[PDB]
Amino acid sequence: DQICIGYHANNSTEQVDTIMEKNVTVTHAQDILEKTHNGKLCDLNGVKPLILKDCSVAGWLLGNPMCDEFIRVPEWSYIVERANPSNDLCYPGSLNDYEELKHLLSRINHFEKILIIPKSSWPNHETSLGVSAACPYQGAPSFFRNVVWLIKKNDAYPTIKISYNNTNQEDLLILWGIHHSNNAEEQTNLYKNPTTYISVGTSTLNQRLVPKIATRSQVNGQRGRMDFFWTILKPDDAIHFESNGNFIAPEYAYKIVKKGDSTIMKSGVEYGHCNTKCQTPVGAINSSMPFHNIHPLTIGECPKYVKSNKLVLATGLRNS
Amino acid sequence: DQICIGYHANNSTEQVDTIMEKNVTVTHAQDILEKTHNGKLCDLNGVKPLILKDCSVAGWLLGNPMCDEFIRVPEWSYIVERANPSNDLCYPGSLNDYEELKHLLSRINHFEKILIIPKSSWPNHETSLGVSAACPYQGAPSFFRNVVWLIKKNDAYPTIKISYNNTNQEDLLILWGIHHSNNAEEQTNLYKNPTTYISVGTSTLNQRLVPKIATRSQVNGQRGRMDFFWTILKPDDAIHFESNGNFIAPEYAYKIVKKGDSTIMKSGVEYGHCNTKCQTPVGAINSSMPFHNIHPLTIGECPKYVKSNKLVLATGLRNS
Amino acid sequence: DQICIGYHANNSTEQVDTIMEKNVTVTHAQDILEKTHNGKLCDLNGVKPLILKDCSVAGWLLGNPMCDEFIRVPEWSYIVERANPSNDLCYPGSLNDYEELKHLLSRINHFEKILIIPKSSWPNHETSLGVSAACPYQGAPSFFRNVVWLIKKNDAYPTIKISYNNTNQEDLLILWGIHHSNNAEEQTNLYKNPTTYISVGTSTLNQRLVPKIATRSQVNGQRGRMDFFWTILKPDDAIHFESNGNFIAPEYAYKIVKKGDSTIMKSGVEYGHCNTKCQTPVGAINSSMPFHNIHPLTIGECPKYVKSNKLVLATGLRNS
Amino acid sequence: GLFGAIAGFIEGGWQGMVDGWYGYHHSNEQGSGYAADKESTQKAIDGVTNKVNSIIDKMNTQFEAVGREFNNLERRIENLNKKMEDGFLDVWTYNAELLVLMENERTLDFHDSNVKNLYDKVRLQLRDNAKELGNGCFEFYHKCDNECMESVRNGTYDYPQYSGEARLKRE
Amino acid sequence: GLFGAIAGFIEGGWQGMVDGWYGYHHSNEQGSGYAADKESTQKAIDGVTNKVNSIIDKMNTQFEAVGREFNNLERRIENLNKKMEDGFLDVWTYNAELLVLMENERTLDFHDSNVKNLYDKVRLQLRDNAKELGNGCFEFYHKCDNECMESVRNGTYDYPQYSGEARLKRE
Amino acid sequence: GLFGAIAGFIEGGWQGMVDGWYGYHHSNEQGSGYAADKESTQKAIDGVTNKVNSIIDKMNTQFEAVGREFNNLERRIENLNKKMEDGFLDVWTYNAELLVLMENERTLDFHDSNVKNLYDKVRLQLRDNAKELGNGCFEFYHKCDNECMESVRNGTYDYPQYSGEARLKRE
Ligand SMILES: *[C@@H]1O[C@H](CO)[C@@H](O[C@@H]2O[C@H](CO)[C@@H](O[C@@H]3O[C@H](CO)[C@@H](O)[C@H](O[C@H]4O[C@H](CO)[C@@H](O)[C@H](O)[C@@H]4O[C@@H]4O[C@H](CO)[C@@H](O[C@@H]5O[C@H](CO)[C@H](O)[C@H](O[C@]6(C(=O)O)C[C@H](O)[C@@H](NC(C)=O)[C@H]([C@H](O)[C@H](O)CO)O6)[C@H]5O)[C@H](O)[C@H]4NC(C)=O)[C@@H]3O)[C@H](O)[C@H]2NC(C)=O)[C@H](O)[C@H]1NC(C)=O
Ligand SMILES: *[C@@H]1O[C@H](CO)[C@@H](O[C@@H]2O[C@H](CO)[C@@H](O[C@@H]3O[C@H](CO)[C@@H](O)[C@H](O[C@H]4O[C@H](CO)[C@@H](O)[C@H](O)[C@@H]4O[C@@H]4O[C@H](CO)[C@@H](O[C@@H]5O[C@H](CO)[C@H](O)[C@H](O[C@]6(C(=O)O)C[C@H](O)[C@@H](NC(C)=O)[C@H]([C@H](O)[C@H](O)CO)O6)[C@H]5O)[C@H](O)[C@H]4NC(C)=O)[C@@H]3O)[C@H](O)[C@H]2NC(C)=O)[C@H](O)[C@H]1NC(C)=O
Ligand SMILES: *[C@@H]1O[C@H](CO)[C@@H](O[C@@H]2O[C@H](CO)[C@@H](O[C@@H]3O[C@H](CO)[C@@H](O)[C@H](O[C@H]4O[C@H](CO)[C@@H](O)[C@H](O)[C@@H]4O[C@@H]4O[C@H](CO)[C@@H](O[C@@H]5O[C@H](CO)[C@H](O)[C@H](O[C@]6(C(=O)O)C[C@H](O)[C@@H](NC(C)=O)[C@H]([C@H](O)[C@H](O)CO)O6)[C@H]5O)[C@H](O)[C@H]4NC(C)=O)[C@@H]3O)[C@H](O)[C@H]2NC(C)=O)[C@H](O)[C@H]1NC(C)=O
Ligand SMILES: *[C@@H]1O[C@H](CO)[C@@H](O)[C@H](O)[C@H]1NC(C)=O
Ligand SMILES: *[C@@H]1O[C@H](CO)[C@@H](O)[C@H](O)[C@H]1NC(C)=O
Ligand SMILES: *[C@@H]1O[C@H](CO)[C@@H](O)[C@H](O)[C@H]1NC(C)=O
Ligand SMILES: *[C@@H]1O[C@H](CO)[C@@H](O)[C@H](O)[C@H]1NC(C)=O
Numbered sequence A, B, C: 001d002q003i004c005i006g007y008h009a010n011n012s013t014e015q016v017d018t019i020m021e022k023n024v025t026v027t028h029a030q031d032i033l034e035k036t037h038n039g040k041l042c043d044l045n046g047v048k049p050l051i052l053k054d055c056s057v058a059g060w061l062l063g064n065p066m067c068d069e070f071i072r073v074p075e076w077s078y079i080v081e082r083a084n085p086s087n088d089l090c091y092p093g094s095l096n097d098y099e100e101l102k103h104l105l106s107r108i109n110h111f112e113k114i115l116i117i118p119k120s121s122w123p124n125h126e127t128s129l130g131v132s133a134a135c136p137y138q139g140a141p142s143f144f145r146n147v148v149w150l151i152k153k154n155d156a157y158p159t160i161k162i163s164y165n166n167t168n169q170e171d172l173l174i175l176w177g178i179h180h181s182n183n184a185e186e187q188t189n190l191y192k193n194p195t196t197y198i199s200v201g202t203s204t205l206n207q208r209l210v211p212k213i214a215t216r217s218q219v220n221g222q223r224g225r226m227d228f229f230w231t232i233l234k235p236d237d238a239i240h241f242e243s244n245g246n247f248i249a250p251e252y253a254y255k256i257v258k259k260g261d262s263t264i265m266k267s268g269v270e271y272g273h274c275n276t277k278c279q280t281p282v283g284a285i286n287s288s289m290p291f292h293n294i295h296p297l298t299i300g301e302c303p304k305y306v307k308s309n310k311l312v313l314a315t316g317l318r319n320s
Numbered sequence D, E, F: 001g002l003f004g005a006i007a008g009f010i011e012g013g014w015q016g017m018v019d020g021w022y023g024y025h026h027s028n029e030q031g032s033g034y035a036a037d038k039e040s041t042q043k044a045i046d047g048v049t050n051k052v053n054s055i056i057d058k059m060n061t062q063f064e065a066v067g068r069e070f071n072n073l074e075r076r077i078e079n080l081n082k083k084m085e086d087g088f089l090d091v092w093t094y095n096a097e098l099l100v101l102m103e104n105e106r107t108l109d110f111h112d113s114n115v116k117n118l119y120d121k122v123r124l125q126l127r128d129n130a131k132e133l134g135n136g137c138f139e140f141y142h143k144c145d146n147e148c149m150e151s152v153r154n155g156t157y158d159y160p161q162y163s164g165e166a167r168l169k170r171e
């Protein structure tokens, strides 16, 4: 004939962290940290990502002969590439504002490649001979697909007067470049003009380029360099090209038809024919936990990243 | 014949937030968040702000013909301008280090405009004809007031040998520029020199400029461009100008007489003939609250900004 | 015949801070803030620091004639120099990417200076006459030790064809520069070439330089300028120099033999023949406290910096 | 609610008590009026005022949100600046919101503990001479004048004098 | 452990009580079975669920850790970006870890205070009619049916009826 | 002050008690000397040491304050770096100062709750055999040797043996 008071006790071994007492056993606890992932590249909201098979962003945009599976790409949710892609600027050189271009490409989900300047628009230059062995195809000298290396034709190189309306309703990404020779004889043997220039003029861009004919060291077997440049042409805006030589004329531009959100992700994981809301270079979080500790860089619906190995919130009473 | 214990209870409906119980009624509470403002531009410590009536910082400094109400300005507490000022570089072009100049101007409260180079110092050039329709005044060709567009006189353009002591005790802001032509005939028809240069030399500045004669697209009806440059001349330091053509010679400099703290604020609010300690692009905080949620950018004596819609600190007991 | 309960009480005057009650006396308290330092420069883990006696980083690397005690330096733990070193670029000019170079030097603990280009490799130029009074030694015209100012010899200046293998297993820091003349006569009187150039070519570097012959103001008695450039040559990588004039040819390079962690510290404190785990521009923390408030910039095993004048954690009960 | 006095133990606060925060419903044959404990309320007001003032004092030093201008080719640096701006505002908003939430517990617990403290203070002085009830009210075994009411308030209750009266009354 | 009920006062929880969190080991001649307080447990569950939900709600806005690319000549800016990345992750990790630590005290204190609260609630209703023991159990002076067990649970204990029985039994 | 034992309930600590933190002023015909509770003090010392060690452990990862150099034309980036430097130092200073303030309450509350806990532990064992007073001291109804003093300390008080003695003495 007596009443009594106590609390619920179970046989679980859940443990929580308290600043004054470690390793406290509780009856019920809620885990708020996610430490598991599928381990494979997985689709983002049902959209297949752009997976560069050992290829770089610049190589894909410039039309690397090896990276020819990206000639026509569908809409993508994010761009994923290896940390050190082997196929990247097969011809030695650099891409100006390459990091800025990658930042700009981080918010583009689709490109519609168009032939702004056809190969028939150069009747007085040579489109056929611009082939290198630093850019080989099926073991034959070849060169980047999306730009044209113009060579002197019939021992002449007339000045280029090329203009192009942006009659489209979307921004156009135009890629051109300049070739730096090695010596004076190479310059006259391939361009016929000792002193050349490249002037590009838009509403906001006023650029003039002069090749640097110097002596450098062999990169990919070539002591020559090619510096590439890019611009974003606004609708109803014209772009003008005037060149005396050393011109890598653009051939294909890119329409920015869809402009959402994305990331450029560095991971060597393989595709898994999957479907996830949040992606990770390590894997994919298939959970709705408050926190996770897989990787700081995460795209999609992603839980918060913390550097803690465990995070358990006590819910029940002490288990004793 | 009995004592009893209770607490104070009132009829108020003040509500506070507790992490384990929302919407808790308390007898007395203190609001620590400010959510109100006057909604008008208001003076900072009794100093009238510099309000640019649809004008930009660069247009004001270069002497935009339309922005002629800022020819002589008094001391200001901060600079306020519209997000997209229509009057900004009436002639197409750019101002080099424009963002850096705005950062430098954020800590200047007064300028004393002086005639460093009078119009009578060019007896062999043409100050009268440098007028454009991209910079019109009362519907007549005109040009920026603070700089001089020098044109060839008597079919000649002698080399400019101009030097200037900074005999003043304050730093001098000097604005000059270079004009980029369209074609070779325009260059010889207006400057008489095909190959021109602009060399500026100070204690810390060694600059050489060459115009880019290319083909661009019409901006404000002009396919030509003008790139402007600025420098801060230290006391007892001389500045030298050597130019063969395409020179937008400085005419008026700016003395940095008062150098305190200020901001460049983007707001379309109108002046209100007011007096406030802290300013906001949205309004002015007339309170001494611990926190506010009007706008992150705030000048003067300003409370802390938080992104919370409410912040109430419980003071009294629970109201029940 | 009665039991009773109380707590420990002592006679100490330790005081702690509570958000609802300041200045609370407690029986026992633990101080977690360090406010003391030795006040002298002190060795880091038994390694003597690199102390620049009123000399700059650029002056030390370029071989300032005054800063000749750093001709051969041992391994150092960190670099310490005055806030405004008097010996810094004795000849007026600038060092390109000087801030970037200092960041790179922040992770280098030892250099092995080597004679990459001996003075006997210039039989057709003049190594002897490149002496200035802006760089005096024992009151005699002199110039930077680690680079060579090349002057025309026998009224001639043949083009320089210099290449150098990096046969070593460590990165090589190469310092070169370009001299900007004052007028055309000075250029022909000292270099014999009116139009000169400097082209430097490596695997990753393609640079061309043209002197700016303008009129500037006297700095250290000289209206001429010298702009210096640096590069990091990778192992098995060659560097090429082609110059027609105005060339400050490199003479001594620097081997990056040890590459750890360090800082560049600005302090005017003197050496103390000491030994500390963590260093500070103000002094050295000889304690293992959780926190300190000496200086935010700290090298070695350093406690956390906070801007609080006191930090005491209560351990015992209230002293009353 | 941790100390369980203001919320659940006593049903509710007194609406007619307008002075101070903690009071005594002294009921006597002379008169049934309210009262207030100046000493307990003042230290409660002092603690609350110290808490809010110290909260403001430690919050005067936060990020100033300085605006900067970047051109079209500095989008990486602009995004670098933009994220810091938002990141510092996010943590400070989290700090301000969480501090209010936690201090709201402490303030209510402080108020909850105080009424429990004044509950215990009267009980420990009165001991067996008063019959403790389910509410915060104490039914005295012995009738006493307003002198005993203020003696309880002053903390100088005379126990031995009234101890005999309660013992004689109790059977 | 602050309120000293769950940890030290009562030796341990009941293993056979699977409903709710706080219960009553009602021992009677009719039967010695367990029970649970629905009202006390529900508000305890509501408070815990509100705490974790509000913790998640205030943690949805943190730093996104956006990656950026820098070239070889922008190491200062890259290190400038890298330290912000780590600095924001460090404070958010500190905020998340510390919040769990502090809320773990509050949750255990809330559970500790609740059992103390249910301890006091039964004691204040029962008063002298029940003999209080060293454990959380109350030994009734008067025997009563399961009606009194549920009356204590419901909070509507009839004191005057059983007060006379306890007084007569006590000597 | 939340639990109201160390500050207001008992007037002050004992100056002559130098061993441990919590003790017993055992007064007896054999001798009136001090004492200390090893078990209660050790867990109090263990908790305090765990608190400070864990505070240091979670504070080893903060911002390093790396210095960088910027030229005259990079004032925007320099100010961008300068504000992050100050912003991270401000939040970490706020985190360190606030953590000390909050943990100072918990440490004092932990000490306040412990004396209240040892207050209740002795009271629940002694029950009616001891007369509870306004201070923390318990006046025993029955005289007992130092065996009873240490029995209370050990937590193994023999109630039934001394229950009859107290009942006979009480009238
Ligand atoms: C510092 O350290 C380095 C090592 O790290 C040392 O380097 C060493 O230097 C010595 C010097 O003697 C070498 O010795 C060698 O010994 C071996 C064995 O006997 C020889 O095989 C070596 O032969 C090389 O030099 C010989 C000198 O007599 C030459 O006779 C020989 O020909 C060879 O030089 C190279 O020859 C090949 C032949 O195919 C050339 O290939 C073609 O040349 C063209 C003109 O330059 C083009 O470059 C062409 O490329 C194409 C392309 O891209 O595909 C063709 C295409 O049609 C073009 N496209 C268009 C549109 O026109 C493009 C286009 O022109 C360009 O892209 C424009 O930019 O070009 C190319 O296939 C090579 O070019 C030519 N060499 C060059 C680059 O000029 C040699 O006798 C050591 O072996 C060597 N060790 C190394 C390198 O590891 C230094 O010595 C060290 N310094 C010191 C001081 O010791
Ligand atoms: C791509 O897309 C675009 C559209 O987005 C298309 O553009 C289209 O191009 C076609 C081409 O035929 C146009 O067709 C037109 O049809 C209409 C209707 O018939 C005509 O009106 C058009 O006339 C234009 O071209 C005619 C060709 O025959 C010309 O005869 C005609 O004159 C006109 O050209 C312009 O003429 C005006 C006359 O006033 C010129 O004004 C003056 O010229 C001066 C020399 O250039 C100066 O520029 C002067 O400016 C001043 C100043 O600033 O005020 C004067 C001042 O005194 C000077 N200051 C000093 C100190 O000396 C300054 C100074 O010199 C400069 O500042 C230095 O920099 O200058 C100026 O007032 C114009 O200049 C001249 N045009 C230019 C810029 O050269 C034409 O027949 C379509 O209408 C057109 N559609 C558009 C534009 O939307 C492209 O075709 C598309 N591409 C393709 C492949 O399809
Ligand atoms: C604005 O404000 C400023 C003040 O802030 C004013 O400046 C003032 O200008 C007036 C103009 O009249 C000055 O008046 C002076 O009055 C006093 C008293 O009478 C005179 O002493 C002054 O004499 C100067 O000008 C005279 C004009 O007649 C000259 O006759 C006189 O010679 C002197 O000019 C200077 O002369 C010295 C003599 O030693 C020159 O020294 C040598 O010159 C060489 C060629 O330029 C080299 O520069 C050489 O340097 C070396 C080196 O570095 O050591 C030598 C070395 O061998 C070389 N190395 C190699 C490898 O070859 C290097 C190398 O060539 C270089 O490094 C390459 O870059 O060079 C050097 O020792 C001086 O050069 C020469 N002056 C120069 C720089 O050209 C004068 O009559 C006021 O005194 C003056 N006030 C001041 C300055 O505070 C302006 O007037 C104001 N503006 C206005 C409008 O008012
Ligand atoms: C699980 O709990 C039951 C009581 O509910 C207990 O008898 C059993 O031993 C527990 N299991 C383990 C493995 O301890
Ligand atoms: C808690 O348990 C884990 C694993 O069971 C162990 O690694 C850790 O050291 C324990 N913490 C203590 C004993 O403080
Ligand atoms: C995981 O993915 C599946 C389908 O891909 C989805 O139904 C589920 O909600 C996701 N989350 C968990 C925790 O399973
Ligand atoms: C205001 O408080 C009084 C008691 O002080 C109460 O009678 C009245 O109803 C309250 N007012 C309202 C609107 O509830």
Ligand SMILES: *[C@@H]1O[C@H](CO)[C@@H](O)[C@H](O)[C@H]1NC(C)=O
Pocket: B022, B023
């Ligand atoms: C608190 O009240 C506000 C407005 O009265 C309401 O919007 C909100 O949903 C309430 N919070 C609850 C019910 O948790």
Ligand SMILES: *[C@@H]1O[C@H](CO)[C@@H](O)[C@H](O)[C@H]1NC(C)=O
Pocket: B275, B286, B287, B288
């Ligand atoms: C508002 O401004 C007035 C005068 O402009 C000043 O007296 C007052 O203190 C300010 N603050 C408030 C809260 O009224």
Ligand SMILES: *[C@@H]1O[C@H](CO)[C@@H](O)[C@H](O)[C@H]1NC(C)=O
Pocket: C010, C011, F015, F016
């Ligand atoms: C130190 O403590 C003793 C008691 O332990 C006390 O008598 C003495 O007065 C104290 N010293 C001071 C300076 O108060």
Ligand SMILES: *[C@@H]1O[C@H](CO)[C@@H](O)[C@H](O)[C@H]1NC(C)=O
Pocket: C022, C023
């Ligand atoms: C605490 O004491 C210090 C020095 O003893 C004094 O400066 C400060 O004002 C005091 N704090 C108060 C009285 O709140």
Ligand SMILES: *[C@@H]1O[C@H](CO)[C@@H](O)[C@H](O)[C@H]1NC(C)=O
Pocket: C275, C286, C287, C288
């Ligand atoms: C200070 O330095 C000495 C030797 O340099 C070392 O033994 C000691 O541990 C250091 N720390 C303290 C607190 O003395």
Ligand SMILES: *[C@@H]1O[C@H](CO)[C@@H](O)[C@H](O)[C@H]1NC(C)=O
Pocket: D150, D154
């Ligand atoms: C007792 O209480 C009365 C309040 O009526 C006050 O005036 C008086 O000072 C108090 N006396 C003491 C000794 O506290």
Ligand SMILES: *[C@@H]1O[C@H](CO)[C@@H](O)[C@H](O)[C@H]1NC(C)=O
Pocket: E150, E154
């Ligand atoms: C009393 O408790 C019983 C539980 O058996 C419940 O069904 C009933 O509704 C309660 N009555 C009241 C008035 O709370």
Ligand SMILES: *[C@@H]1O[C@H](CO)[C@@H](O)[C@H](O)[C@H]1NC(C)=O
Pocket: F150, F154
């Ligand atoms: C009782 O207390 C004494 C202290 O004098 C101790 O030595 C002994 O071990 C304790 N016994 C038990 C059973 O705790």
